[PDB]
Design a protein around this ligand. Structure first.
Ligand SMILES: O=C(O)[C@H]1O[C@@H](Oc2ccc([N+](=O)[O-])cc2)[C@H](O)[C@@H](O)[C@@H]1O[C@H]1O[C@H](CO)[C@@H](O[C@@H]2O[C@@H](C(=O)O)[C@@H](O[C@H]3O[C@H](CO)[C@@H](O[C@@H]4O[C@H](C(=O)O)[C@@H](O[C@H]5O[C@H](CO)[C@@H](O)[C@H](O)[C@H]5NS(=O)(=O)O)[C@H](O)[C@H]4O)[C@H](O)[C@H]3NS(=O)(=O)O)[C@H](O)[C@H]2OS(=O)(=O)O)[C@H](O)[C@H]1NS(=O)(=O)O
Ligand SMILES: OC[C@H]1O[C@H](O[C@H]2[C@H](O)[C@@H](O)[C@@H](O[C@H]3[C@H](O)[C@@H](O)[C@@H](O[C@H]4[C@H](O)[C@@H](O)[C@@H](O)O[C@@H]4CO)O[C@@H]3CO)O[C@@H]2CO)[C@H](O)[C@@H](O)[C@@H]1O
Ligand code: A3P
Ligand code: CL
Ligand code: CL
Ligand code: CL
Ligand code: NA
Ligand code: NA
Ligand code: NA
Ligand code: NA
Length: 670
């Protein structure tokens, strides 16, 4: 981001040419250039890049995305004088308040309306229920009743919400993120109605924004559902159209989710005062908003003065009627998870590939961020025969507390013949009774015989050969921000693990495949910024990479597939390999780790594990924006760890409960 310039991101359906005109007036008056851009998926890109030092100075989107950005420390708190605040409606400032603080400037209120072609349909239907009859009439005339975007849940939500669907329950002054309303009876009735429209061929599951718009603007369909921004192209096509209240469902109004177009200032912007000037003194004026509105209409604008001027527009009147009947969107971080969940459910139900009930049940789980596991997933019972052919393999991922855990395995297990650890010696002899055979494959027993910090791909391909059986793989995991910081501090004091083989498909990577991040013998002294800056840093997503089958993505050769393909493959593979291990622990839960290891393998430790809170990672003072960048660099690991933590804690609860029941049944004999 350059100082002395402004870069603005706004969505491609908004009046970006008009906004650019406002930017040119600002430049005329100040010599400060303003660049407007409309990148694809800007709302996903922003948290990915703002966290570094790219990204725009100002980001426009509906307010629902901004709580998540604010929680990650990506937005500047905005500081409008009371005089300026009174220029906009309080309704709209509420939309942009997060945890007591204002995090953007409200621009305009948007709600979906029913848009109809007066030359085909001079009185639009008041109910969804009458649409099938109407369509049958229109099809006899070579036309259809209704087409609108079925791919984005924003457009189908009004119907799903009408009879009772909700996102998050509002209770006791906040949104309850555990009380999700996507699979209740009302939600199902709404979605069932839409699925039925499609089954009876009144609508097509494939219809998206473009297809619906093209059909309406060409007079092929009598109605569409869309926002104020859409009116411009309709006027361009010279359709004679009206904008009205959405139809009712089961006698109740359609309830669109209401958005407030909002302008946030990037926390990493060196231009915060200039951004403030532009927004307050150029855009949020009658003239600024008029310039944007003339390009693509904004809806009901937040600035009282200009909102009064346009209030008489019946299109805006209908927009206000639908907005009053709907609900303002929450701005909480969990909104994007809600939307992603509903997006998928609606597509799969609409296609007929999944029933409404199953699809919404899946959305419910996802929106509430829950994990369902089978009994088999929770039950890990290993008749561990040290006398037999069983071998425990400890896959040690760097900085997960593996030195501690590995020392526990060789020093701390009560065995008839425990490991023989001679004083002042690194390794131990962990042999079966009476034999010269090892029961533990690990750094402190066999050594790094399949390579330094051999990962899942290496171990599974090397261990069986180098020991000739039942192999019981185990590992430890750590929250990724802490694990990443720990690795940065260890590298900063000389760690490189440069002798690791990184073997996959029978060879090590080439330098082109895996470039080194440092010149010279090591990366000692590196700052966190420079650590984060190397694209090929093996610290990034280390736990996923080391638990996945790397052959599935072409090993270390990043040209063999795109990131959009490679990433889901890695995550799924790591989840599967982890889940299917005999056991794993979490660094943050030392005692639960001990207990589950003991109950999995039917072993006991001599001395209790202990929790060390005062780690080197814990001592790093971490800005929220920086934490967020570390999360983004480790996003696969963040997902793996969320999964792993939940499974681990569900395993703990399951095993403890069972043990408590057993004790009790025993007492209920005596
Ligand atoms: O045996 C020979 O061939 C011998 O021959 C001699 O010549 C003759 C001998 C005899 C006769 N005769 O007539 O009788 C004639 C001639 C010749 O002079 C020798 O050069 C030659 O020796 C060669 O072979 C021997 C046997 O293989 C080698 O000795 C082995 O290896 C040594 C070594 O590699 O240094 C040494 O191993 C011990 O020390 C290592 C280094 O510390 C240990 O490995 C390290 O483990 C670290 C760890 O786990 O902590 C790891 O650290 C990294 O990860 C951790 C955890 O994440 C981080 O904390 C660290 O920060 C991180 N550091 S990093 O970022 O820098 O990576 C390290 O990476 C890893 O290197 C090793 O575990 C330890 N083994 S031990 O405990 O068992 O002792 C030993 O002497 C020996 O090991 S072993 O074979 O017994 O297992 C010798 O090196 C080799 N010399 S060479 O010149 O040919 O290469
Ligand atoms: O990978 C699947 C898709 O993911 C991406 O879309 C996501 C967004 O990132 C989420 O934020 C959300 O989108 C919401 C949006 O936040 C909300 O404001 C509303 O968007 C309206 C907008 O208010 C209005 O101004 C106008 O622009 O129409 C928008 C709807 O098209 O509703 C959205 C949900 O429909 O969820 C979506 C996933 O549905 C990514 O951008 C996609 O390209 C990708 O396919
Ligand atoms: N019992 C324990 N409780 C909490 N953290 C522990 C621990 N034993 C080790 N760790 C942490 O695990 C990291 C070392 O992992 P490894 O042995 O795999 O290199 C260190 O993190 P820090 O570097 O942040 O201090 C260390 O503090
Ligand atoms: Cl070794
Ligand atoms: Cl614990
Ligand atoms: Cl037990
Ligand atoms: Na040795
Ligand atoms: Na260490
Ligand atoms: Na160096
Ligand atoms: Na800290």
């Amino acid at each position: 981001i350059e100082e002395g310039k402004l870069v603005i991101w706004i969505n491609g359906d908004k009046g970006y040419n008009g906004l650019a005109e406002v930017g040119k007036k600002f430049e005329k008056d100040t010599g400060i250039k303003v660049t407007v851009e409309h990148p694809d998926k800007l709302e996903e890109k922003f948290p990915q890049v703002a966290a570094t030092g790219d990204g725009p100075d100002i980001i426009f989107w509906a307010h629902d995305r901004f709580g998540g950005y604010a929680q990650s420390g990506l937005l500047a708190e905005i500081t409008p004088a009371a005089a300026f605040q009174d220029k906009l409606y309080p309704f709209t400032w509420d939309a942009v308040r997060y945890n007591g603080k204002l995090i953007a400037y409200p621009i305009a209120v948007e709600a979906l309306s029913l848009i109809y072609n007066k030359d085909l349909l001079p009185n639009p239907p008041k109910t969804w229920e009458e649409i099938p009859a109407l369509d049958k009439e229109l099809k006899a005339k070579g036309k259809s009743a209704l087409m609108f975007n079925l791919q984005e849940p924003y457009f189908t939500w009004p119907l799903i919400a009408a009879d009772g669907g909700y996102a998050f329950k509002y209770a006791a002054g906040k949104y309850d993120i555990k009380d999700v309303g996507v699979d209740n009876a009302g939600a199902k009735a709404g979605l069932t109605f839409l699925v039925d429209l499609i089954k009876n061929k009144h609508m097509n599951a494939d219809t998206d924004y473009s297809i619906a718009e093209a059909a309406f603007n060409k007079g092929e369909t009598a109605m569409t559902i869309n926002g104020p921004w859409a009116w411009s192209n309709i006027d361009t096509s010279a359709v004679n159209y009206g904008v009205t209240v959405l139809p009712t469902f089961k006698g109740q109004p359609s309830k669109p989710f209401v958005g407030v177009l909002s302008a946030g200032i990037n926390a990493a912007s060196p231009n915060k005062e200039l951004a403030k000037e532009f927004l307050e003194n150029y855009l949020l004026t009658d003239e600024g908003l008029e310039a944007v509105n003339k390009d693509k209409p904004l809806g009901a604008v937040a600035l009282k003065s200009y909102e009064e001027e346009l209030a008489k527009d019946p299109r805006i009147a209908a927009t206000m009627e639908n907005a009053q009947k709907g609900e303002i969107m929450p701005n909480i971080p969990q909104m994007s998870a809600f939307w992603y969940a509903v997006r998928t459910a609606v597509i799969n139900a609409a296609s007929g590939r999944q029933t409404v009930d199953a699809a919404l049940a899946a959305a419910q789980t996802n929106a509430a961020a829950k994990f369902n596991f089978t009994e088999r997933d929770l039950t890990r019972d290993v008749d561990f025969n040290i006398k037999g052919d069983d071998v425990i393999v400890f896959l040690h991922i760097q900085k997960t507390g593996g030195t501690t855990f590995g020392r526990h395995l060789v020093r701390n297990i009560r065995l008839e013949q425990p490991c023989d650890c001679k004083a002042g010696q690194k390794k131990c002899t962990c042999h079966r009774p009476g034999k010269q055979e090892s029961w533990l494959f690990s750094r402190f027993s066999t050594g790094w015989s399949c390579g330094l910090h051999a990962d899942w791909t290496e171990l599974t391909n090397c261990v069986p050969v180098i020991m000739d059986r039942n192999f019981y793989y185990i590992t430890m995991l750590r929250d990724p921000v802490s694990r990443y910081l720990s690795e940065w501090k260890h590298v900063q004091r000389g760690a490189t693990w440069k002798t690791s083989l990184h073997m996959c498909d029978g060879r090590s990577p080439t330098q082109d495949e895996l470039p080194t991040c440092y010149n010279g013998d090591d990366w000692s002294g590196v700052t966190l910024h420079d650590f984060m800056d190397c694209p090929s840093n093996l610290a990034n997503n280390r736990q996923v990479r080391m638990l996945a089958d790397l052959s599935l993505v072409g090993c270390y050769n990043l040209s063999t597939m795109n990131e959009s393909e490679r990433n889901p493959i890695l995550l799924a593979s790591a989840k599967s390999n982890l889940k299917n291990m005999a056991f794993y622990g979490l660094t943050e839960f030392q005692r639960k780790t001990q207990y589950l290891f003991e109950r999995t393998f039917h072993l006991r430790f001599i001395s209790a594990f202990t929790q060390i809170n005062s780690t080197r990672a814990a001592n790093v003072e971490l800005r929220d924006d920086m934490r967020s960048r570390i999360e983004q660099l480790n996003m696969l690991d963040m997902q793996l760890y969320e999964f792993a933590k939940d499974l681990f804690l569900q395993r703990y609860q399951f095993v403890r409960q069972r043990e408590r029941q057993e004790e009790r049944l025993k007492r209920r004999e005596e």
